[PDB]
Amino acid sequence: EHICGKKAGSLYLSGAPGTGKTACLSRILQDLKKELKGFKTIMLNCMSLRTAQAVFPAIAQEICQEEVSRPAGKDMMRKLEKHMTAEKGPMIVLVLDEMDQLDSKGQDVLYTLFEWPWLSNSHLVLIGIANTLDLTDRILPRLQAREKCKPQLLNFPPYTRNQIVTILQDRLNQVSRDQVLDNAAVQ
């Protein structure tokens, strides 16, 4: 609905603490490349960033694929949000990960990435892959206070025996010739 209806907003995915859902989002991203051709998706891997800063310039080198530039020192919050508001460019999709680890003493770095798809020219979809540690209490104080932002929340319940036993039937019976254990040990 966002790529066809020309819409853009935020989407906070609060996954279960440690369940291995990183491969679920990778399946959807690769299916959109073979369906539609014209858009570009920039990845994010802030595992080597021990500080709260040096995050925006790390993804500033990907402007429009073939058109790149170079940093000049102290130039954020000016050129990154300028190219996003351009209606002549394609719909850029930004992926977010471990957003809880990017906090600060006043989480000021998280006040600019959640207000871009809500001001003029909303052409950015927010996708945050992170487990459940804390909801909207101190990270995003705009909720339960401001009536401008309307985020969406989706949770994932823990898989009981209805899914763990099911995920093993299509795992061993499709690649092995004969099972090595009985059905009583699976339960």
């Binding site: 603490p17 459940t132 206070a145 823990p158």
Partner: protein
């Protein structure tokens, strides 16, 4: 007369209640409009005093920020004017002084301490006699500038007649933020303002209660064995709440109650089930003198009473 259990008007809304607040009461609305136009007759009166090194003080009733927004669209189109509306928990002295460096003076930010930037901007407006700057600061008395180090920075800029300061006062302790050593630079000129209009902007820092969606979406993505433990400690909390000496249940009786209600099996596995509760600000441990880690829930007394009614399905 007690907590929040006698009245059914619990859980105050934040965004789902502004739909019914737009229908205001038109009680003598004609007399309130002409009161605002009474101050509009003195349009060409502010520039006759601000150019001599004076300021404008705004006090009284009504929304002080909803009045200056109309004066800017009538005579502030060709003059260097900067409006400051610092009310959200994040406004400081660094977001205002460093904002006139790469925009007004065109210079990148590279200062060191606080005193290094104060004496650097004075030389730019003292040697040049053609750098006017109007400061339309809204609600100067916020909540994060009560210290004496905040007025001494802006007080130095008031000594020059080329800098115009326009602030609003919404507190009965107006002379509590400045003494005689600072009034010589500002030279406050009091002007009463009567608007009679509520505030629908800065209402966010005040304490509402906690969102009920957080306690509901935390149990859906939780293991089935952990939900029975959370629903067991809430029963023993309200039954012993009448005791004023409630210090919390111990760990020995808590470990015995688990197997009595078919829960955990060992001790190290029980401690692993309390990892997602201490990180979600649900329970915490205290350094007890008896060597026993107490278990309490730092929430409101009326919040736990409304949790047993939503789990009936």
């Amino acid at each position: 007369d007690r907590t929040l259990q006698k009245l059914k008007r619990a859980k105050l809304d934040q965004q789902t209640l502004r739909n019914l607040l737009s229908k205001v009461s038109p009680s003598f609305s004609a007399e309130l409009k002409q009161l605002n136009q009474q101050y509009e007759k003195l349009f060409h009166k502010w520039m006759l005093q601000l150019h001599l090194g004076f300021n404008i003080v705004l006090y009284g009733l009504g929304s002080k920020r909803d009045l200056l927004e109309r004066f800017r669209t009538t005579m502030l189109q060709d003059s260097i004017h900067v409006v400051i509306n610092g009310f959200f928990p994040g406004i400081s002295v660094k977001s205002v002084l460093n904002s006139i460096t790469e925009e007004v003076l065109d210079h990148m930010g590279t200062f060191r301490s606080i005193l290094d930037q104060l004496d650097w901007i004075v030389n730019k407006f003292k040697e040049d006699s053609s750098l006017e700057l109007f400061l339309l600061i809204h609600n100067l008395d916020s909540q994060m500038l009560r210290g004496e180090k905040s007025q001494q920075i802006i007080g130095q800029l008031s000594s020059l007649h080329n800098i115009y300061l326009i602030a609003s006062i919404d507190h009965l302790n107006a002379p509590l933020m400045w003494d005689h050593a600072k009034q010589s630079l500002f030279n406050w000129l009091w002007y009463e303002t009567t608007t009679y209009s509520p505030y629908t902007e800065e209402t966010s820092y005040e304490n509402s209660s906690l969102p009920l969606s957080s306690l509901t979406h935390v149990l859906r993505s939780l293991t089935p064995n952990a939900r029975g433990i959370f629903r067991l400690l809430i029963k023993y909390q309200l039954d012993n709440q009448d005791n004023p000496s409630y210090i919390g249940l111990s760990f020995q009786d808590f470990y015995q109650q688990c197997r009595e209600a078919f829960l955990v099996n060992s001790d190290l596995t029980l401690r692993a089930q309390l990892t997602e509760f201490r990180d979600h600000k649900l329970i915490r441990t205290k350094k007890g003198t008896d060597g026993v880690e107490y278990l309490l829930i730092p929430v409101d007394n009326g919040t736990l009473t409304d949790f047993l009614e939503k789990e009936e399905e």
